[PDB]
Each structure stands twice: as C-alpha cells, then as structure tokens.
Design a binder for this molecule. Structure first.
Ligand SMILES: O[C@H]1[C@H](O)[C@@H](O)OC[C@H]1O
Ligand SMILES: [Cl-]
Length: 289
C-alpha cells in the first residue's frame, strides 16, 4: 500500500478545450484531498498518436494511475494494455475506449442523453420540422452515441426529418461556417442540435448577426455543456435548452477511483453514470456538475 505522497496520478483530457477545465478542477480537488501527486497532461490535437505518446511517458515514469478521455478509441487500445501489464491502473472518463482493458468508465450515458434531446425537440416542435445535428470530431464515441440517440429517438416522430449531420472538430470558426451553410440551405429549418460544446456558441454567434438575426425565435436550439457562451445564448434566447454533464464530478471520481485501485481496495470496478441535467432559462443557476 503506497504512502499517499508517493502516489502519482495523471489525468488526460481530449485536448486543452473549455469543457475539460472542470474535469481538471474536480480531479485536482480530489487529488489534494487525497494527498497524492497529480498531473494534468494535455494533448495538442485530437488525433490519437498524440495520446499514445503521453501514456508511454507515464509508463516510463512508473506513475501509478492514468485517467483519460479518449478522442478515438481504437488508437489507444494497445498502449493502455501495456500500462496495465506494468501495474498502472487505468480508467476512462467522459469518452470511453471499451476495448483498452480499462478498469471502468466514468461519464455520461451518451446515447441516453441523445434520446432525451430527441424527446425534448419532438415535444417542442409538436412532432413537425426539419432539423440539423452539429457535432465535433467525427471519431468521438461519446459524440457519435449522442447522435445515434437523437436519430433513434426522432424515429418516433414521422413529421420530423434530419436534413443535415455535420462535424466541426469543435473549431468555433468551423462551427460558424457550418451553421451559416445550414441556415442558408434550409430556410424552413425548425431545429438544431449541438451535441458537442461548440454547437451552442456557434449557433448563438451566427444568430446574432445581421444576415441571420430574423431567425431568432424561429428555431428550437438544443446544445451541450454549459460554457459561458452557451449560458449567454440561453440567457439571450438564442438557445432554448442545454444538456449539462457532470465534468467536475467525473474528474473527482476519476482520481478517487484511481487512488482506490492503486491502494488495492476497489473491489471489482464498475462503470459510473454521472448523469446529465436538462437546463433551460428557468433552472440555469441551480444545476451542478
Ligand atoms: O460535450 C463535451 C464532450 O463530453 C467532451 O468529450 O468533449 C467536449 C465537449 O464536446
Ligand atoms: Cl467554443
């Protein structure tokens, strides 16, 4: 049983993007509570090779635990298995890699979150209208599950049609371009889903322009996460609903379960559904993460 101060854990986001600041906060809080050494290790891009290199270094340093949010699941399966054969405890959070041999996944039930968005939209549109889906990186499991949940849920509504599903790699400028093109192609668009953190900010940015201002109030917009721009969009009426995950709680649990596994008292890991809050203007101050 390692002395807490000799315990070393590392937490890896998909990249330095806004959502993961909360995961860092929650992990750092839990590590400090636990008295262990903690590092936040950030990829430079979303590709995959970049996260393999990080795990090899961590192997090299005989660190005790690794928690990772995975950009693309297949890429990282091989190096995560070696880490485990070196005694390193490994788990995922936010975005899973199910065949990496990781002990457990901590995060949202992403297909169910999509399903919930679909019900919200279907009710809001009275089962009628063209809709578009804006995603981030096309290889992301959690994002693709969200999309699958939306499409399966919308199948209940014959009068709704998904006319567009497009990615952005969560580049805001790319998101703006995509949203601009969508609105031009579909003047009778009735709804938009943003299943990654950029979708809300991009839709609000585009709707708040001279060219598209008249679309304000015409569309039902549902977005993911609670980035300040998204909250401002919800405040301003450009966004009608969001889905808020529990990123702080993910980071906290990630460290706590790493420590428990490292110290040999995690009897049989099990996935944790950290849950997701449907947030509108009416409850936007009282949700937690
Ligand atoms: O919605 C979140 C997602 O859970 C995470 O994986 O990437 C950042 C945001 O897109
Ligand atoms: Cl953004």
């Amino acid at each position: 049983m390692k002395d807490a101060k000799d315990i070393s854990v590392a937490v890896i986001p998909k990249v330095a993007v806004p959502f993961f600041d909360d995961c860092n906060k929650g992990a750092k809080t839990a590590a400090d509570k636990a008295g262990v050494k903690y590092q936040w290790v950030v990829p430079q891009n979303t590709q995959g090779s970049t996260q393999v290199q990080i795990i090899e270094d961590l192997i090299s340093r005989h660190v005790d635990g690794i928690a990772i949010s995975v950009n693309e699941p297949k890429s990282v399966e091989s190096v995560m298995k070696r880490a485990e054969q070196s005694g390193i405890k490994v788990l995922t959070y936010d975005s899973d890699s199910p065949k990496s041999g990781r002990s457990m996944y901590i995060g949202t039930n992403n297909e169910q979150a999509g399903a919930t968005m679909a019900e919200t939209m279907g009710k809001a549109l009275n089962g009628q209208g063209e809709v578009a889906i804006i995603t981030g990186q096309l290889g992301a499991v959690n994002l693709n599950e969200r999309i699958a949940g939306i499409k399966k849920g919308l199948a209940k509504y014959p009068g709704i049609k998904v006319v567009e599903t497009q990615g952005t790699d969560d580049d805001l400028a790319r998101g703006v371009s995509v949203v601009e093109t969508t609105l031009r192609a579909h003047p009778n668009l009735k709804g938009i889903f943003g299943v990654s953190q950029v979708g809300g900010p991009a839709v609000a940015k585009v709707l708040n322009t001279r060219e598209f201002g008249a679309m304000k109030g015409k569309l039902e917009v549902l977005a993911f996460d609670d980035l300040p721009d998204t909250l401002k969009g919800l405040k301003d009426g450009y966004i009608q609903g969001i889905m808020v995950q529990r990123p702080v709680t993910m980071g906290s649990l990630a460290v706590d379960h790493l420590v428990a596994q490292i110290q040999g008292q995690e009897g049989q890991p099990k996935d944790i559904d950290t849950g997701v809050t449907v947030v509108t203007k009416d409850n936007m101050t009282s949700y937690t993460k």
